[PDB]
Design a protein around this motif. Sequence first.
Motif, PDB file in Angstrom:
ATOM      1  N   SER D   1       0.811  -1.209   0.000  1.00  0.00           N
ATOM      2  CA  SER D   1       0.000   0.000   0.000  1.00  0.00           C
ATOM      3  C   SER D   1       0.847   1.264   0.000  1.00  0.00           C
ATOM      4  CB  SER D   1      -0.951   0.006   1.197  1.00  0.00           C
ATOM      5  OG  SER D   1      -0.291   0.464   2.360  1.00  0.00           O
ATOM      6  N   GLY D   2       2.143   1.153  -0.272  1.00  0.00           N
ATOM      7  CA  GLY D   2       2.992   2.319  -0.391  1.00  0.00           C
ATOM      8  C   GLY D   2       3.479   2.914   0.909  1.00  0.00           C
ATOM      9  N   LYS D   3       3.604   2.115   1.970  1.00  0.00           N
ATOM     10  CA  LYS D   3       4.038   2.652   3.256  1.00  0.00           C
ATOM     11  C   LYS D   3       5.547   2.863   3.286  1.00  0.00           C
ATOM     12  CE  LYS D   3       2.241  -0.932   5.349  1.00  0.00           C
ATOM     13  NZ  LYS D   3       1.266  -1.723   4.557  1.00  0.00           N
ATOM     14  N   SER D   4       6.307   1.816   2.955  1.00  0.00           N
ATOM     15  CA  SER D   4       7.761   1.903   3.000  1.00  0.00           C
ATOM     16  C   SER D   4       8.268   2.984   2.059  1.00  0.00           C
ATOM     17  CB  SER D   4       8.376   0.550   2.645  1.00  0.00           C
ATOM     18  OG  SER D   4       9.739   0.495   3.026  1.00  0.00           O
ATOM     19  N   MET D   5       7.749   2.997   0.833  1.00  0.00           N
ATOM     20  CA  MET D   5       8.137   4.019  -0.124  1.00  0.00           C
ATOM     21  C   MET D   5       7.772   5.404   0.387  1.00  0.00           C
ATOM     22  SD  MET D   5       9.953   3.489  -2.662  1.00  0.00           S
ATOM     23  CE  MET D   5       9.577   1.739  -2.655  1.00  0.00           C
ATOM     24  N   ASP D 145      -1.978   1.725 -11.725  1.00  0.00           N
ATOM     25  CA  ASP D 145      -1.300   2.566 -12.705  1.00  0.00           C
ATOM     26  C   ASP D 145       0.022   3.088 -12.160  1.00  0.00           C
ATOM     27  OD1 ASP D 145      -3.313   2.254 -14.601  1.00  0.00           O
ATOM     28  OD2 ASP D 145      -4.458   3.953 -13.814  1.00  0.00           O
ATOM     29  N   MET D 146       0.070   3.389 -10.861  1.00  0.00           N
ATOM     30  CA  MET D 146       1.313   3.844 -10.250  1.00  0.00           C
ATOM     31  C   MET D 146       2.396   2.780 -10.365  1.00  0.00           C
ATOM     32  SD  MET D 146      -0.054   5.857  -6.869  1.00  0.00           S
ATOM     33  CE  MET D 146       1.532   6.319  -6.188  1.00  0.00           C
ATOM     34  N   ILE D 147       2.039   1.525 -10.086  1.00  0.00           N
ATOM     35  CA  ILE D 147       2.996   0.429 -10.189  1.00  0.00           C
ATOM     36  C   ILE D 147       3.438   0.244 -11.633  1.00  0.00           C
ATOM     37  CG2 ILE D 147       3.466  -1.910  -9.407  1.00  0.00           C
ATOM     38  CD1 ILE D 147       1.067  -1.781  -7.643  1.00  0.00           C
ATOM     39  N   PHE D 148       2.496   0.337 -12.576  1.00  0.00           N
ATOM     40  CA  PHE D 148       2.857   0.201 -13.984  1.00  0.00           C
ATOM     41  C   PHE D 148       3.823   1.295 -14.419  1.00  0.00           C
ATOM     42  CE2 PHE D 148      -1.344  -2.115 -14.994  1.00  0.00           C
ATOM     43  CZ  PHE D 148      -0.782  -3.294 -14.558  1.00  0.00           C
ATOM     44  N   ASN D 149       3.558   2.539 -14.014  1.00  0.00           N
ATOM     45  CA  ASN D 149       4.445   3.639 -14.374  1.00  0.00           C
ATOM     46  C   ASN D 149       5.827   3.448 -13.770  1.00  0.00           C
ATOM     47  OD1 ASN D 149       1.973   4.412 -15.308  1.00  0.00           O
ATOM     48  ND2 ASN D 149       1.943   6.415 -14.296  1.00  0.00           N
ATOM     49  N   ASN D 150       5.890   3.009 -12.511  1.00  0.00           N
ATOM     50  CA  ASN D 150       7.188   2.751 -11.895  1.00  0.00           C
ATOM     51  C   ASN D 150       7.946   1.664 -12.645  1.00  0.00           C
ATOM     52  OD1 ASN D 150       8.459   0.708  -9.492  1.00  0.00           O
ATOM     53  ND2 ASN D 150       9.229   2.812  -9.597  1.00  0.00           N
ATOM     54  N   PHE D 151       7.259   0.574 -12.994  1.00  0.00           N
ATOM     55  CA  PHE D 151       7.908  -0.518 -13.708  1.00  0.00           C
ATOM     56  C   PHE D 151       8.438  -0.049 -15.055  1.00  0.00           C
ATOM     57  CE2 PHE D 151       6.933  -3.848 -16.989  1.00  0.00           C
ATOM     58  CZ  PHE D 151       8.143  -4.497 -16.874  1.00  0.00           C
ATOM     59  N   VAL D 440      14.956 -11.083   1.957  1.00  0.00           N
ATOM     60  CA  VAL D 440      14.540 -10.908   0.569  1.00  0.00           C
ATOM     61  C   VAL D 440      14.257  -9.443   0.259  1.00  0.00           C
ATOM     62  CG1 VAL D 440      12.626 -11.327  -0.987  1.00  0.00           C
ATOM     63  CG2 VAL D 440      13.765 -13.244   0.116  1.00  0.00           C
ATOM     64  N   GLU D 441      13.525  -8.758   1.133  1.00  0.00           N
ATOM     65  CA  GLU D 441      13.123  -7.381   0.879  1.00  0.00           C
ATOM     66  C   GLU D 441      14.265  -6.393   1.092  1.00  0.00           C
ATOM     67  OE1 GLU D 441       9.784  -6.158   3.192  1.00  0.00           O
ATOM     68  OE2 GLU D 441       9.641  -4.176   2.258  1.00  0.00           O
ATOM     69  N   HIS D 442      14.982  -6.515   2.205  1.00  0.00           N
ATOM     70  CA  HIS D 442      16.035  -5.572   2.553  1.00  0.00           C
ATOM     71  C   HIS D 442      17.426  -6.042   2.151  1.00  0.00           C
ATOM     72  CE1 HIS D 442      12.803  -4.747   5.682  1.00  0.00           C
ATOM     73  NE2 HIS D 442      12.837  -3.648   4.950  1.00  0.00           N
TER      74      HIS D 442
HETATM   75  N1  LIG Z   1       4.614   6.527  -5.232  1.00  0.00           N
HETATM   76  C1  LIG Z   1       4.897   5.408  -5.906  1.00  0.00           C
HETATM   77  N2  LIG Z   1       4.998   5.476  -7.252  1.00  0.00           N
HETATM   78  C2  LIG Z   1       5.281   4.361  -7.930  1.00  0.00           C
HETATM   79  N3  LIG Z   1       5.489   3.128  -7.465  1.00  0.00           N
HETATM   80  C3  LIG Z   1       5.383   3.092  -6.135  1.00  0.00           C
HETATM   81  C4  LIG Z   1       5.096   4.156  -5.297  1.00  0.00           C
HETATM   82  N4  LIG Z   1       5.068   3.746  -3.973  1.00  0.00           N
HETATM   83  C5  LIG Z   1       5.333   2.465  -4.040  1.00  0.00           C
HETATM   84  N5  LIG Z   1       5.533   2.001  -5.313  1.00  0.00           N
HETATM   85  C6  LIG Z   1       5.849   0.634  -5.706  1.00  0.00           C
HETATM   86  O1  LIG Z   1       4.739  -0.186  -5.381  1.00  0.00           O
HETATM   87  C7  LIG Z   1       5.162  -1.289  -4.552  1.00  0.00           C
HETATM   88  C8  LIG Z   1       4.754  -1.029  -3.125  1.00  0.00           C
HETATM   89  O2  LIG Z   1       5.858  -1.356  -2.256  1.00  0.00           O
HETATM   90  P1  LIG Z   1       5.993  -0.704  -0.825  1.00  0.00           P
HETATM   91  O3  LIG Z   1       7.278  -1.055  -0.189  1.00  0.00           O
HETATM   92  O4  LIG Z   1       5.728   0.791  -0.955  1.00  0.00           O
HETATM   93  O5  LIG Z   1       4.772  -1.322  -0.032  1.00  0.00           O
HETATM   94  P2  LIG Z   1       4.269  -1.350   1.477  1.00  0.00           P
HETATM   95  O6  LIG Z   1       3.044  -0.555   1.666  1.00  0.00           O
HETATM   96  O7  LIG Z   1       5.456  -0.954   2.349  1.00  0.00           O
HETATM   97  O8  LIG Z   1       4.023  -2.892   1.708  1.00  0.00           O
HETATM   98  P3  LIG Z   1       4.434  -4.046   2.717  1.00  0.00           P
HETATM   99  O9  LIG Z   1       3.767  -3.849   4.035  1.00  0.00           O
HETATM  100  O10 LIG Z   1       4.022  -5.337   2.012  1.00  0.00           O
HETATM  101  O11 LIG Z   1       5.957  -3.979   2.773  1.00  0.00           O
HETATM  102  C9  LIG Z   1       6.661  -1.403  -4.788  1.00  0.00           C
HETATM  103  O12 LIG Z   1       6.938  -2.175  -5.950  1.00  0.00           O
HETATM  104  C10 LIG Z   1       7.069   0.058  -4.979  1.00  0.00           C
HETATM  105  O13 LIG Z   1       8.235   0.176  -5.785  1.00  0.00           O
END
Ligand SMILES: Nc1ncnc2c1ncn2[C@@H]1O[C@H](COP(=O)(O)OP(=O)(O)OP(=O)(O)O)[C@@H](O)[C@H]1O
Lengths: 145, 194, 145, 948, 48, 48, 145
Positions: D1-5, D145-151, D440-442
């Motif tokens: 849900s975009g928390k870490s980012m 769409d955000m994920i697609f644009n990032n990819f 795996v993640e970090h």
């Molecule tokens: N603002 C953004 N724009 C584009 N892509 C994003 C954005 N924020 C996150 N992403 C991407 O979407 C995915 C979400 O990963 P993220 O680490 O943000 O999730 P999270 O909410 O921390 O989840 P979790 O609790 O499972 O770790 C990743 O692939 C990340 O690269």
Amino acid sequence: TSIAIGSAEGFNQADKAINTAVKSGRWVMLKNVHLAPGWLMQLEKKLHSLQPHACFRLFLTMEINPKVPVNLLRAGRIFVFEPPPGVKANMLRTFSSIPVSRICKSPNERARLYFLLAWFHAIIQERLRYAPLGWSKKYEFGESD
Amino acid sequence: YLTMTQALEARLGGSPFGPAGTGKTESVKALGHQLGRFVLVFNCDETFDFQAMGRIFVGLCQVGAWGCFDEFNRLEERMLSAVSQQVQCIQEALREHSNPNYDKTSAPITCELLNKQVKVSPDMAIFITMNPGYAGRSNLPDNLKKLFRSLAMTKPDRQLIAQVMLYSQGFRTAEVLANKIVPFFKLCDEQLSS
Amino acid sequence: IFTGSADIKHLLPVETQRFQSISTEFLALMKKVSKSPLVMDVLNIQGVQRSLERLADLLGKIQKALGEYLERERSSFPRFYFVGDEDLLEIIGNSKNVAKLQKHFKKMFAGVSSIILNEDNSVVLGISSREGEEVMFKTPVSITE
Amino acid sequence: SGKSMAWRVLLKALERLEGVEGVAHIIDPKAISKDHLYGTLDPNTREWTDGLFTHVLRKIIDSVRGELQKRQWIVFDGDVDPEWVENLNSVLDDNKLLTLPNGERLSLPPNVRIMFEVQDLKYATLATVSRCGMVWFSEDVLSTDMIFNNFLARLRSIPLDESPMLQIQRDAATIMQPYFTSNGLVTKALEHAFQLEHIMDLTRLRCLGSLFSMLHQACRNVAQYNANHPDFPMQIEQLERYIQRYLVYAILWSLSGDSRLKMRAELGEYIRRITTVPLPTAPNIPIIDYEVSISGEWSPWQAKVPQIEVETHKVAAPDVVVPTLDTVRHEALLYTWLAEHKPLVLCGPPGSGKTMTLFSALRALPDMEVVGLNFSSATTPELLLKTFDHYCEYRRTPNGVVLAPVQLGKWLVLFCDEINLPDMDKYGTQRVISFIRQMVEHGGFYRTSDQTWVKLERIQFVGACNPPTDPGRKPLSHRFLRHVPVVYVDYPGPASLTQIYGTFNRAMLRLIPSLRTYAEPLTAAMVEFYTMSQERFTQDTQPHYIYSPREMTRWVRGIFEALRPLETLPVEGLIRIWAHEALRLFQDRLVEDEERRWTDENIDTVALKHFPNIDREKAMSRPILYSNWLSKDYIPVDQEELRDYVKARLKVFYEEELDVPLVLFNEVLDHVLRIDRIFRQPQGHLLLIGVSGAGKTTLSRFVAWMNGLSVYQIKVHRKYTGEDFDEDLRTVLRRSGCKNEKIAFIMDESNVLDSGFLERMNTLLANGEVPGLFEGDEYATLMTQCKEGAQKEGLMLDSHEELYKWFTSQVIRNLHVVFTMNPSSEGLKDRAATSPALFNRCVLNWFGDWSTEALYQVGKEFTSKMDLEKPNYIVPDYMPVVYDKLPQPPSHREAIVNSCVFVHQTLHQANARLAKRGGRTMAITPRHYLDFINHYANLFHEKRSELE
Amino acid sequence: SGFLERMNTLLANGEVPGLFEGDEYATLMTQCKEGAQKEGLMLDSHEE
Amino acid sequence: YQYSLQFFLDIYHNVLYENPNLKGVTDHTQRLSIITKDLFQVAFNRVA
Amino acid sequence: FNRYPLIIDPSGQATEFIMNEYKDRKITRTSFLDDAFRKNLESALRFGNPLLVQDVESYDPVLNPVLNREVRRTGGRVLITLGDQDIDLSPSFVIFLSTRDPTVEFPPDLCSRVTFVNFTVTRSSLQSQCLNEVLKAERPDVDEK
Ligand SMILES: Nc1ncnc2c1ncn2[C@@H]1O[C@H](COP(=O)(O)OP(=O)(O)OP(=O)(O)O)[C@@H](O)[C@H]1O
Ligand SMILES: Nc1ncnc2c1ncn2[C@@H]1O[C@H](COP(=O)(O)OP(=O)(O)O)[C@@H](O)[C@H]1O
Ligand SMILES: Nc1ncnc2c1ncn2[C@@H]1O[C@H](COP(=O)(O)OP(=O)(O)O)[C@@H](O)[C@H]1O
Ligand SMILES: Nc1ncnc2c1ncn2[C@@H]1O[C@H](COP(=O)(O)OP(=O)(O)O)[C@@H](O)[C@H]1O
Ligand SMILES: [Mg+2]
Ligand SMILES: [Mg+2]
């Protein structure tokens, strides 16, 4: 010698106190021994093979709990402490607990006050037997209050 | 304050209990600050074994500070039973400090903590804070509960607190503001999704 | 610690000799550094990084061996019971230079965050809290005395 | 849900805007023990050792390197439960203190923020929630769409190799752009895929990650095609065709790769209904059967499954893979996933071929070496740490500590076989799973020895697991599944099974040309029988009633081993060997008699149906026994000849090894044959389940003495600890691997005094090697003895790696473990998950209690010396028959033996009655029967002599 | 005569320089470590 | 409610030898009746 | 008995009966909890002396070869593997396991390795004991006669 059970140094103190008292004839008391049932098993086994002094006594204060080994229960004599059956018994216990000197103090009214207190006490704990009506929950109205 | 001072006069400890966020630890600290006491807050857990508690008690008795042990029921039941002995020794030392015949020109009062004689300052006190509503928390043995005077701290007076805080911060309409904000918090609690 | 104290030599002799050897090596290295203070010239000294690592390991080993001395020092001043081992070592060692002790008072007092000292750092004029509030002693305390 | 980012972006933005350096410490609180997180107080020394969080906070407070001038964010990235977070109650409160048990109190600096990144708070208490500021990130916050644009941005900007390849990436992104739009192909496929049912809970990010990895592999394939064709670099038209076809193929294999064939077909039909990409024109063949050729055309997978003829000496071999449609599809998928170094999960029923498929796909990757790990219910991160210690190395670089494999240029892959078994805490968290997710993640973890962040290098993770609905299997965390794509490996169908094992039976029966015409029926019969077995004995009845293609492979291998030395054999002999192997594989593990009788009758019917015009009696006489004791070939043996031979061998055994007389009877002969079958197989471990005193240990020792194996038993006492067991394991492994001494390690369930014992046994049975057993001086001594051994059999091996591999091979070949337990139900169910290898690498023999026939034979043979001859005995009108096979005009001796058996059974019923009445019962064992008959003989002789 | 050489070296110095080597040396180092720790004398490097 | 046989034997001995109701009673049948009544009473008291 | 007996006697009379029965054959008493259990057991095995081991609920698995009679006859020697050492078994050895807790539950292997001898209290025996006690207490002449 009163010892609270639950720690290794507590076990060492209990062992030493018993070892000295079985010879010297003093009293040993161990509280909350239900928290170490295994050590209770070895304690009963140790107690079985002893010829202590005539005046030696061991008290084991426990709360009613299934984890207490039945070997210890059979080895010893059990006394059950619980709320007095009624108001009369409660007041009798209350008056027995308080020393006569304390009640019979120079203010002559004091005794009456104590009596009132006893009655009040003997009331509220009794109402605990009727959990929804006497109160809203089983409060721990005990001897400390 | 009344219950805690009554417990202190009888050389007992204080046990305010009630749900979280009712103002138990803060009330104990405020009472300690009212009497000018050094109050230490300890976040107890299962790793507070017997020697650690003994060392803490030795420190408190020497310095003459207040020990507010919050979440007391997180210790093990056997461990609470063990600590009860130290609590009783400390309370007996305080009680014999309170006696009239002894004066400060005699030998200082000492209690046997951790197999050593430790001086006990009269300003030292022990307070335990717990919420017995949690599942899985240890049950205090009765011989330890009889060493504390308990008090239910369940429903804090939110309205008065809000009114006084807003009044003291310079809000001219503090009364109406509090009377609007406290019911608003209640409505937020029991109108939104759970 | 090992120079400002007397009983430590009689009670911890092995620590005393080992710290004397470590101090000898440290002073030798620091003199070599003082001869040419160029950071590069220090750098290309052969076997200096591993020497420093060995010095760190030995000093850390010595620190862990002062438990009983720290316990006795805690017995000397009661508030030291609320101070960690490394912080207590820092306080006792830097007692001469009171400038480093200002960050340790918050652990020992309810509201005292730093002490007020004269230009000589020799007389304690008063105390200060974390928010800048100050209390001036009526009679100052002399560190030299 | 975009928390870490979100928090990383905020940290960077604050650092740039305010000029204050932002430092973030990411800690997984539940990936390590709470003692390792907050610290320990030594009970003996009373010396405080900092944890992870305590060390970080103390270092920040000390500010030796100016940490108080920076913005410090400690982020607890993991599950929250009231065990560890409540110790932060003073930290999160206005006290802002961390109070440790040693009396130390650490004040929180004003520049330090404590942050939690969690997915739920369903276990966090109110005291914890109320103390923190909440920020709720809904899943709708991060749009697809955000994920697609990032990819797409990363694809266009980042080179996949480490520019022509950048041009390939940009062209591919341009082609894929129309499909990566709102309401486009990918989003529609995603929203439909949630309607299907999968073997695991489906998440958007897992599917997207699998798709992105596969598209990266597509770009790599284009780059390789261009490299192999320098004269003609691949053009735009063929590129567009290839990318569209590969994109639809990757959508299919991502969004339905973890589901049944039916759901894959449904997804294919829906995609064909919605898409505009050209597709195969087959009428009924689902799209999933078509790969995408590098030329840019659909190509059926069936073209790459040639009908092969396996070598006659390599039939049913562990490393032999018969290509199949599912086999090639899964192999290609696994190659694509591993080539990107993306961790993956193989989910499916046991024995479906997950490990086989992974190892087969691993053949195409020579730079990559696999290390096996077998998770259990007691598996902790310590297993991973021991494996890293053995195979990897911690090196210090200026950027920190890096853990990398010792062998340069190679990628280490940790194949963990039982991902979903480790015990889930009562707050819904598996520690080893969180620890794997942290790596795996970090890209690394924390060393708790000095609390130092260690970055992984060249380390890959592959997991295997049964479906989470199986008993003992726990559903994996959603936050873990987002990084690992899951592929469902289902059981081979009847057609595929027929193909594979018909190929095996052909390559087998080529040894005997006269039988070459019977390959087609034989295989069919096998499959048919296996099919009914798999639908007759389900895991619902007993935990060990699991039948898989492993049983078929064992069937083929045993039949081949029997037919290997024979020069000629009629169809009757082949049928007899087929039936014998069927009995040994399907009837040994059966618990009660009805199933054994059913198996016998059903083998009869299957053999009759698939093999008519044969002599029923000649090929299927009921006492089917095979042995190589009276000859050099595994040929059928007569019961009486075998009985006399075993009697002579036991007479030798009593004088030589163990002077304990035994009574021989048919079940003992069958059992010793079963044990001998396994003491002759490599890595052949036994699991004997039966009532105590039934002779399991004694028969095991007798068979070991027959085969020359040295019997080893651990000598347990009251003060036996884990260290003693480790010492015994080192001793037995040294004897079995360094001295080439065949050992039968016999152990009973009573010897297991700790779950650590079962963990060690699980690892040893599954891998033939305990990773953390030999370390320090023991390791050096082990390499010394291994070197002397290796040079003794004339192997030129000096370096530690191949010496250890040779030691592992020697242990695998020479060590046979016999496990004995009582036939408990709850105990068996618990062990089915506590030690999975005990049911996967151990052949199970259900001895049970002595049957009524066994008791009758024992009594009849034992009371032969007793007179028991009453010529004027009158048979009663209603004889209370107990042994149903007792002669109807019985003799006096037969009546006596029947009475003895009735006595044993009435003690059984008396204990049953006491158990039903709530009383306490003591189990009746065959030793009670032996004592009874011994007392009978002694009392009879005494009383007769006294009377005379 | 090797017996007498070893005995001479052991008698004069209390240690034979070549007696412990290889795995024997590492095992001796470990036992020396644990024995020094038991006595109350903490040491980690091989020379001391 | 776990009682050993020794507990009952102690009850019996107390009723037989340490019975305060047998001070001056000498009639055998009267003593037996007193013994029975006191056995019931003492058993109830000690168990309860 | 064929298998070595396990006695269950809460009253302890069975242990006295066994000790009196085997007194002339030098029977010795020990327990599984005793640290001297191993040496006493091996002494009894070597010299063939009767052994009485109490606290069988704390059973030591070291007796498994002894209870199963796993003897090896080689070179004119009858050897028993007691732990890690071979001992020349004497044919006159005998062992009796005892317990005072009737409620103990033994694992099936131990129940198989021993034969149970339960010394329960029967109604007839209790009536006889009580009748003898009352006769001795109230009619001493009659009981003595
Ligand atoms: N603002 C953004 N724009 C584009 N892509 C994003 C954005 N924020 C996150 N992403 C991407 O979407 C995915 C979400 O990963 P993220 O680490 O943000 O999730 P999270 O909410 O921390 O989840 P979790 O609790 O499972 O770790 C990743 O692939 C990340 O690269
Ligand atoms: N009488 C009061 N006046 C002002 N604030 C209060 C009062 N009682 C409670 N609070 C506030 O409520 C918050 C929570 O109280 P806390 O000490 O956490 O109670 P508990 O011990 O139940 O967790 C504290 O931050 C405190 O400032
Ligand atoms: N296509 C195939 N070709 C050859 N053997 C196969 C095939 N499919 C299944 N098998 C057999 O199935 C077994 C798979 O076992 P394994 O891979 O260990 O299962 P899991 O990975 O579920 O533990 C192998 O022994 C193999 O002989
Ligand atoms: N077929 C048999 N004939 C005679 N005695 C037997 C037989 N099987 C087992 N026993 C008895 O069982 C004892 C050993 O049992 P054991 O095999 O250790 O039990 P478990 O099978 O539970 O390990 C021996 O003393 C032996 O007398
Ligand atoms: Mg609080
Ligand atoms: Mg995240």
